[PDB]
Design a protein around this ligand. Structure first.
Ligand SMILES: Cc1cccc(NCc2ccccc2)n1
Ligand SMILES: Cc1cccc(NCc2ccccc2)n1
Ligand SMILES: [Zn+2]
Ligand SMILES: [Zn+2]
Ligand SMILES: [Zn+2]
Ligand SMILES: [Zn+2]
Lengths: 357, 357
C-alpha cells in the first residue's frame, strides 16, 4: 500500500542522510541523534497530503502504462523520494515561519524553536538544514534520472515563489507606500489593501505553489508524463483549489476550537489579511467598518471579541457558501478540460479536490 | 578591469531579478524597492574576495588558453555570475547568523535584522530569498552551459556543509554527551571539547568550504578546467588557508580595536571555541585553567577582562608565529604540487594565499 511504502522511504532517506553525515561530514553520534530527532519532530505527524499526492499521481499513471515490475517499483520509489522533498520543504517553511511569527503551537505540539534544548539560535539553522536535505535527496536518488534537470528547476521556482509569498504575507498589514527598511512599519489604518485580488496574490505564492502545484507536477515528472497534460490547466486548477484550502484555514483560525485546530488562532491579533477580514470589509456598513478598524490587530482579548462578534453578525457563513459553490463550478470545469489529454491525471485532481473539500 | 566587470554584473543581475519579480511574481514597486535595498545592504560593502576569486581563477586560464574574443567575454561573464552566487550565499548566512547570535554590528554597519523597517520577522525570510536568488541566477545565466549540473551539485554540497558547520559552531560550548532537544543546554564546565581537532572541524565546515573551496572550484568549472587539476590538492590547500583565515579572525575578535574590526568582539562572552581558547588551554598551568573556567562565557565585563589578561600573559603571540610558520610550509608545499598539472591554477592559489596572509 502507498502510505506504507511512503513511510518506509522516510526511514530509508533518514538512514541515508544520517549515515552520510557520519561518513562524509565528520558528525559525532550525539549531533546525529539531535538531527534525527529534529527531522522526526519537524517532518512527521501530519497527514502527508503533499508527499502522498506525488505518489497518487504516479499510481494513476502506473495503472494505465506498460512497464516491467522493477520499473513500476522504481517509479513508486522516486515518487516517494519526491514526495519527501516536498514534506521537508514544508518542514523548512513551518520551522522558519513559527520563529518569524513567534508562534506557540503547531498541530497540537510546541513549535520546534520552543523546545528547551533547541532555542531560536539552533532552530533557524535547523530549518536551513531541512531545506538542504531536499537537495541532498534529489542528487543522491535522482542522479541518473532523465527528469533531474526539470525536477530541480521546478522545485527551485516553487521554493522561491513560497519565500516571495511569505514576504507578501508578513507585509500584508502594512501600507505598501510606506514600506521602507529605514522606517518602523505602522499597521494600516485604512485597510485599503484588504482586497480579494491582494488576498489571492498572498495565497497563490505563500501556499498554492508548494501545496498543490509542486506535488501534481512532481508526480507527472517522476512518471515521465508531463507531455500528457496541458501545464496551464494544471497551474489554473492548482490556483483554484489552493485558494479554497486557505479560505478554509482562515475561517477555522477564528471559529474552530483550539483543540481541533491544533493551536490558538491569532489572525485577528496579528492583523492578518484573512478571507474573513476581506469578506467582512466587502459587505459591512460604515459603522461596522469603523468598529472593525478600532479593534483589529491588537492583542487585547476584549478587542479580539468585538471582531469575532462583527464576523458572526455579518453572516459570513452565507458568503462562504456562495464562494464554495463558485469554486466547485470552476474546479469541475478544469477537471473536464484535463480529461481531453489525460483522464488518469483528471482523476488524481478530483481526488486532491475531494481531500480538500 | 576585473572588479569593474564584476560590479557591472551585480547591477545586471539585480535588474534581472527585480524585473522577473515584476513580470512573473506579481510584485508591486514598493516591495521591489524593499528587496533592492535588502540586496544592496546585505550583498555590498565587502572586499568581494570570494566572488573575485572565481573571476581571478578564470582570468588565469584565459591568459593561457586559445579562445575567440566572444568566448573570453562569455567565460568572464559566467565567472562574475558564479562569483555573485557565492557572495549571495555568504549574504544568506551572515543575515541568518546575525539573527541567531543576536549580533549588533557587521563590518561597521548595524545587522540587517536591526533595521527599523525590517525586524527579525522579515529578516529571516529576506535571508531565505538571498539564497533562493543564487539558484535563480544559475538557472537563468547557465541554462545551456555544460557545467550547470556540476556547478549546482558542488554549490549544494558546499551550502549543506556550511549549515552543518553552523550547527558545529552554535553547539561548540555544549558537552556533546548532553545534547538533547528536550533539555536546556548548560555551557561546558570541563572545556574537554576545546581541542585542535574539534576547532579544525568547526572551521572546515563553517568557513572553509564556502570561502575557499567553492570560489576555486567554481573558477575551474566556468573555465571547463577541472580536469587540469588534482581535486584532492584543491581541497587540501583550501582546508589549510581557510583554517589560517579563521585563526586570524579569532585573534582579531579579542585584540583588534572595534573600529578596525567593524564590531565589538563577543567570542569570550559567547563561550566560543576560538583558537585563543584552544591554544591557551593547550599551554596553561592548573591555576590559569581554573581562572579561565571561572570567567569564560559570561557577559560580565570584569570577567571578560580576566580572560583577555590570561591570553596576554600566556604569550599566544609566540604560538601564532609558530602556527603561521607551519601553515606557510604546508601551503607552499601544496602550491608546488599544484604546479605539476597546472602552473596557472597554482598562481591563482598563491594570490589567494597572499590576500589571506
Ligand atoms: C515531543 C514533544 C511533544 C510535546 C512536548 C515536548 N516537550 C516539552 C516542551 C517543549 C517545548 C515547549 C514546551 C514544552 N516534546
Ligand atoms: C544604510 C544604513 C547604515 C547605517 C545605519 C542605518 N540606519 C539606522 C539604523 C539601522 C539599524 C539599527 C540602528 C540604526 N542605515
Ligand atoms: Zn507566518
Ligand atoms: Zn492560518
Ligand atoms: Zn554565528
Ligand atoms: Zn569571529
Amino acid at each position: 500500500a502507498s502510505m506504507e511504502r511512503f513511510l518506509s522511504v522516510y526511514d530509508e532517506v533518514q538512514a541515508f542522510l544520517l549515515d552520510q553525515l557520519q561518513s562524509k561530514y565528520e558528525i559525532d553520534p550525539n549531533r546525529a541523534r539531535y538531527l534525527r530527532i529534529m527531522m522526526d519532530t519537524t517532518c512527521l505527524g501530519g497527514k502527508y497530503f503533499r508527499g502522498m499526492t506525488v505518489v497518487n499521481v504516479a499510481e494513476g499513471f502506473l495503472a494505465v502504462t506498460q512497464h516491467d515490475e522493477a520499473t513500476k517499483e522504481r517509479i513508486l520509489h522516486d515518487a516517494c523520494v519526491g514526495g519527501w522533498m516536498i514534506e521537508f520543504l514544508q518542514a523548512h517553511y513551518l520551522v522558519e515561519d513559527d520563529i518569524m511569527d513567534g508562534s506557540v503551537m503547531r498541530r497540537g505540539k510546541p513549535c520546534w524553536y520552543r523546545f528547551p534544548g533547541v532555542t531560536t539560535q539552533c532552530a533557524i539553522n535547523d530549518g536551513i538544514i531541512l531545506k538542504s536535505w531536499t537537495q541532498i535527496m534529489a542528487w543522491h536518488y535522482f542522479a541518473d534520472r532523465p527528469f533531474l534537470k526539470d525536477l530541480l528547476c521546478l522545485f527551485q521556482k516553487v521554493d522561491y515563489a513560497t519565500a516571495v509569498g511569505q514576504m507578501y504575507d508578513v507585509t500584508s498589514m502594512c501600507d505598501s507606500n510606506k514600506l521602507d527598511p529605514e522606517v518602523a512599519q505602522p499597521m494600516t489604518t485604512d485597510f485599503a489593501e484588504f482586497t480579494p485580488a491582494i488576498y489571492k496574490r498572498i495565497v497563490k505564492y505563500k501556499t498554492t505553489f508548494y501545496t498543490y502545484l509542486l506535488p501534481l507536477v512532481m508526480g507527472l515528472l517522476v512518471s515521465e508524463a508531463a507531455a500528457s497534460v496541458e501545464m496551464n490547466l494544471v497551474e489554473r486548477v492548482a490556483h483554484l483549489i489552493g485558494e479554497y484550502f486557505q479560505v478554509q484555514d482562515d475561517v477555522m483560525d477564528c471559529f474552530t476550537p483550539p483543540e481541533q485546530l491544533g493551536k490558538v488562532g491569532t489572525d485577528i491579533e496579528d492583523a492578518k489579511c484573512s478571507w474573513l477580514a476581506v469578506t467582512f470589509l466587502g459587505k459591512a456598513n460604515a459603522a461596522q467598518v469603523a468598529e472593525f478598524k478600532a479593534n483589529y490587530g491588537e492583542k487585547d482579548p476584549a478587542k479580539v471579541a468585538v471582531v469575532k462578534r462583527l464576523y458572526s453578525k455579518a453572516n459570513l457563513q452565507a458568503d462562504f457558501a456562495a464562494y464554495e459553490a463558485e469554486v466547485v463550478r470552476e474546479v469541475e470545469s478544469l477537471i473536464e478540460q484535463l480529461k481531453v489529454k489525460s483522464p488518469t491525471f483528471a482523476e488524481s485532481v478530483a481526488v486532491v479536490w475531494e481531500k480538500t473539500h
